[PDB]
């Protein structure tokens, strides 16, 4: 086994700028004979299979952008991406392709960095169809914010609601490089019924008053 | 115009075996080597093998030699990986990726979702995210309770991806429950039609729900 590691886990850069992974082998992949690294690096987008980007260690792949450049040798091997856009959001695999098994490194996250962006809040009450299931759904959507870290608190009628609530990141926006969370308080038709009144709270670093959305159910 | 074509996510007990298909259109099934790869989820790639089509030849990752076996047909240019005494920790994508003549894999399949379960396959519930009676409009799908992964949700059959967020699923209930944001002009809401496309292939259930106002 030859071990690929990587450094750092993750990055994180605003648009623009310049960063530099490792990849560290635990042999050489250095072939003396004809002189090349058989290392190969991969992009991978979330949900989506790795797409190759440098293979021979430095030789960029047809249709690869020359801001992505492969560097080293033997066991030393560095990806940069000198102008980082915001497509570029994805995590970076390198490979061992010299000798079995081939093996990948744990790869890198790059993550992109931006302008504080606050959160567009929406509530929703459970949907007719959903009554009849027994069940009723309170759905909370905060989208488009920055940074990632967010909190949401929900209330009954003034009265906040710990459990029962479940919460979703999306990745990272590959175009604005915003996040969105969306927040689901479900109980049963008759609790749901026993109340009137529900409130969706998002306090964020953004602003010290929450931005607070709210249902009744006799409106 | 390469293409990897891979059998639909499945739904497998622990225990059994499964077998995955690639079909490999576009260029010479006999003439390249057809490699595996498996992807945990949350984790890192882990290579499995090769076979080359054009003459049975395979090489397997001592990992998973055990409990692997890469054929193909020539005749259907397809690739298939069997995979058996599957256990939870096999739950994972499985890409097959062709490599070239250089040094890499330039192409790759979509990926086939296997999850090792004794839970039973449940379609979604889809219910649709209305503003409450009382610039822009955001609407959404609610996807609750189904199993296993994935699902694939879009607006107005694709033609609606700008503001779309699809959130990923959490396992709650046994069961997994997504939701999905839209954002259109609210000048064209309930003017025009919204409508989410929930697909659940291991269900093989489709449910177009269209948004209307309460």
């Known amino acids: 086994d030859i071990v690929m590691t990587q450094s750092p886990s993750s990055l994180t850069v605003t648009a623009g700028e310049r960063v530099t992974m490792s990849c560290k082998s635990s042999?050489?992949?250095?072939?003396?004979?004809?002189?090349?690294?058989?290392l190969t690096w991969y992009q991978q987008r979330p949900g989506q299979p790795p797409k190759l980007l440098i293979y021979?260690?430095?030789t960029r792949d047809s249709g690869v952008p020359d801001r992505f450049t492969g560097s080293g040798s033997g066991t030393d091997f560095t990806l940069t991406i000198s102008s980082v856009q915001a497509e570029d959001l994805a995590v970076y695999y390198c490979?061992?392709?010299?000798?079995?098994?081939?093996?990948f490194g744990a790869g890198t996250k790059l993550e992109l960095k931006r302008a504080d962006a606050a959160p567009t809040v929406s509530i929703f009450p459970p949907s007719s169809e959903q009554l009849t299931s027994g069940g009723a759904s309170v759905v909370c959507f905060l989208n488009n914010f920055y940074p990632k870290d967010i909190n949401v608190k929900w209330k009954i009628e003034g009265s906040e609601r710990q459990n029962g609530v479940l919460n979703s990141w999306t990745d990272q926006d590959s175009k604005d490089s915003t996040y969105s969370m969306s927040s689901t308080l479900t109980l049963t038709k008759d609790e749901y019924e026993r109340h009137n009144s529900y409130t969706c709270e998002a306090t964020h670093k953004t602003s010290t008053s929450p931005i607070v959305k709210s249902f009744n159910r006799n409106e | 115009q390469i293409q990897l074509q891979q059998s639909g996510p499945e739904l497998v007990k622990p225990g059994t075996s499964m077998n995955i298909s690639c079909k490999a259109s576009?260029?010479?099934?006999?003439?390249?080597?057809m490699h595996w790869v498996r992807q945990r989820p949350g984790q890192g790639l882990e290579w499995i093998g090769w076979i080359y089509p054009g003459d049975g030849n395979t090489h397997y990752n001592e990992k998973f030699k055990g409990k692997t076996t890469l054929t193909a047909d020539t005749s259907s240019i397809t690739a298939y990986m069997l995979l058996s005494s599957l256990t939870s920790e096999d739950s994972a994508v499985y890409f097959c990726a062709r490599d070239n003549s250089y040094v890499g894999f330039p192409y790759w399949g979509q990926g086939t979702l296997v999850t090792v379960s004794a839970a039973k396959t449940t379609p979604p519930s889809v219910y649709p995210l209305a503003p409450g009676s009382a610039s822009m409009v955001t609407l959404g799908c609610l996807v609750k309770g189904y199993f296993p992964e994935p699902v694939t949700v879009t607006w107005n059959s694709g033609s609606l991806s700008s503001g779309v967020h699809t959130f990923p699923a959490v396992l709650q209930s046994d069961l997994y429950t997504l939701s999905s944001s839209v954002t259109v002009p609210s000048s064209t809401w309930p003017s025009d039609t919204v409508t989410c496309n929930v697909a659940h292939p291991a269900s093989s259930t489709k449910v177009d729900k269209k948004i209307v106002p309460r």
């Open positions: 576009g260029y010479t099934f006999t003439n390249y080597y």
């Open positions: 042999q050489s992949l250095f072939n003396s004979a004809n002189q090349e690294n058989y």
């Open positions: 490979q061992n392709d010299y000798s079995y098994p081939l093996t």
């Open positions: 021979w260690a430095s």
